[PDB]
Design a protein. Structure first.
Ligand SMILES: [Mg+2]
Length: 476
RNA sequence: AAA
């Protein structure tokens, strides 16, 4: 039996790719995968059903997982008659792992052995896995689905597949999309457009694919070629209909151009197809907020008459959708911050607070996103609740979690104004002392940082944070 | 899916 458990780990499939269930909302993934099967016909059905099966096992539904794996076998027979045996390895891997979890050891073995046989047949240098670009590609996609944390591992996976077939249409889409997301991940300030080239190439290799095209259009918006982008959008919309995975990215395009009504039209159309989508609900709320803001700016932050009436309607709508986004994807960090921010604007602080505090307890979202929550809660504390003590705290956490980001200077500027103010009132305010300590340390003003920590330590001598700072402050 |  220990021999079997050893062999399982050697297999190449979802069970050995470190896809941790904690890093996602299991229901959202299971749901959206289901929706991708119905409404994203470009993507591999065999891959989605292999992934679905694994997801279902993470939900503790091993019986349904097998059923999913059966669908895959049928798809293997259908789409991959030729190259049947080699397309079965991942499916067979999930089978062996799923049966092992159901304590059907004899059955689990039947699959590993079935996998072993195929490996020597096409003698790969490994006994229970065969390196393959299509599998590297499936790997890339599963990784992507498990969120921000996996993007680099995803990128590499596609890179491994493209190493073999640099001109494969499918492979290029995966890579291009991955680099496109990494353009929007862990930004330090300005926008990134490493993905522009790979998308160019992806599109050329996939002429009829409007899903890949929409990313090129958005990436062209990002780099101030809005004209070229919008023409790409118009071409797509006249070329496809009611494909939620395409309409929603066109909606985004229009939204940023401030064409909110046209964005709302496209979203709504995507919605009647896929009404539970957290993507769509977020984008909707964003449009209502923006429209709401446009009015406030046009009335110097104090609308009267039908304006105030409209603004309150927009707020309520934006709340409805942010909440929907949040309820559908418990891992959707910006669903929480936008919801709470809108509750704040609405003056329902109790609701703002409850949403923020849930967002502050998400352990497994990325540091970049943790960082944004600390930032927004900090502002809520400062401007709505007027608690400078609490805001200073959260600006510090934001920087501690991620110190180089487009928020860096908003955070250090805020910490400096607040700490100075509070120190003009009480020169012995410790939190404010360690605050300027931390910031000056961050800015490289090593001496001023030391002075601030020394004043802090004089007040709170055996503080292990201030002792640590002064030390590491002496170590350059 | 925010900036
Ligand atoms: Mg999603």
């Amino acid at each position: 039996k220990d021999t079997l458990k050893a062999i399982l780990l050697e297999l190449e499939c979802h069970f050995t790719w470190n896809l941790l269930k904690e890093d996602i909302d299991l229901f959202e993934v299971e749901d959206t995968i289901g929706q991708q099967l119905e409404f994203l016909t470009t993507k591999s059905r065999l891959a989605l059903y292999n992934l679905l099966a694994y997801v279902k096992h993470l939900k503790g539904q091993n019986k349904d997982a097998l059923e999913c794996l059966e669908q895959a076998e049928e798809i293997i027979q259908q789409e991959h008659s030729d190259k049947e045996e080699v397309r079965s390895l991942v499916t067979w891997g999930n089978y062996a792992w799923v049966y092992y979890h159901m304590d059907q050891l004899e059955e689990a073995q039947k699959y590993t052995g079935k996998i072993g046989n195929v490996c020597k047949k096409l003698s790969s240098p490994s006994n229970y896995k065969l390196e393959c670009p299509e599998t590297d590609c499936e790997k890339g996609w599963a990784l992507l689905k498990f969120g921000g944390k996996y993007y680099q591992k995803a990128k590499a996976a596609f890179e491994k597949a493209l190493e073999v077939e640099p001109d494969n249409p499918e492979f290029n889409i995966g890579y291009a999309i991955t680099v496109y997301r990494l353009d929007d991940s862990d930004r330090e300030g300005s926008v990134k457009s490493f993905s522009l080239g790979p998308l160019r190439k992806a599109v050329t290799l996939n002429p009829d694919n409007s899903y890949i095209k929409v990313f090129l259009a958005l990436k062209l918006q990002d780099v101030h070629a809005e004209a070229e982008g919008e023409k790409y959008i118009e071409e797509i919309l006249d070329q496809i209909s009611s494909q939620p995975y395409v309409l929603r990215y066109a909606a985004k395009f229009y939204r940023r151009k401030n064409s909110w009504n046209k964005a709302l039209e496209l979203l709504k159309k995507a919605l009647e197809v896929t009404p539970t989508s957290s993507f769509l609900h977020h984008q909707m709320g964003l449009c209502y907020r923006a429209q709401m803001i446009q009015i406030k700016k046009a009335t110097h932050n104090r609308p009267k008459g039908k304006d105030k009436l409209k603004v309150d309607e927009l707020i309520s709508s934006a709340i409805f959708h942010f909440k929907a986004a949040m309820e559908r994807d418990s891992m959707f960090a910006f669903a929480y911050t936008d919801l709470a921010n809108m509750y704040a604007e609405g003056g329902q602080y109790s609701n703002a607070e409850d949403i923020f505090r849930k967002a502050l307890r998400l352990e497994n979202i990325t540091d970049d996103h943790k960082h944004q929550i600390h930032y927004h809660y900090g502002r809520f504390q400062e401007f709505h609740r007027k608690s400078e003590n609490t805001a200073i705290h959260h600006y510090l956490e934001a920087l501690k979690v991620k110190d180089r980001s487009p928020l860096r200077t908003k955070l250090t500027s805020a910490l400096k104004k607040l700490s100075t103010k509070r120190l003009c009132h009480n020169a012995l305010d410790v939190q404010s002392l360690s605050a300027l300590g931390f910031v000056y340390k961050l800015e490289g003003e090593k001496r001023q940082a030391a002075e601030y920590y020394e004043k802090a330590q004089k007040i709170d001598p055996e503080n292990a944070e201030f002792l640590t700072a002064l030390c590491e402050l002496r170590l350059s």
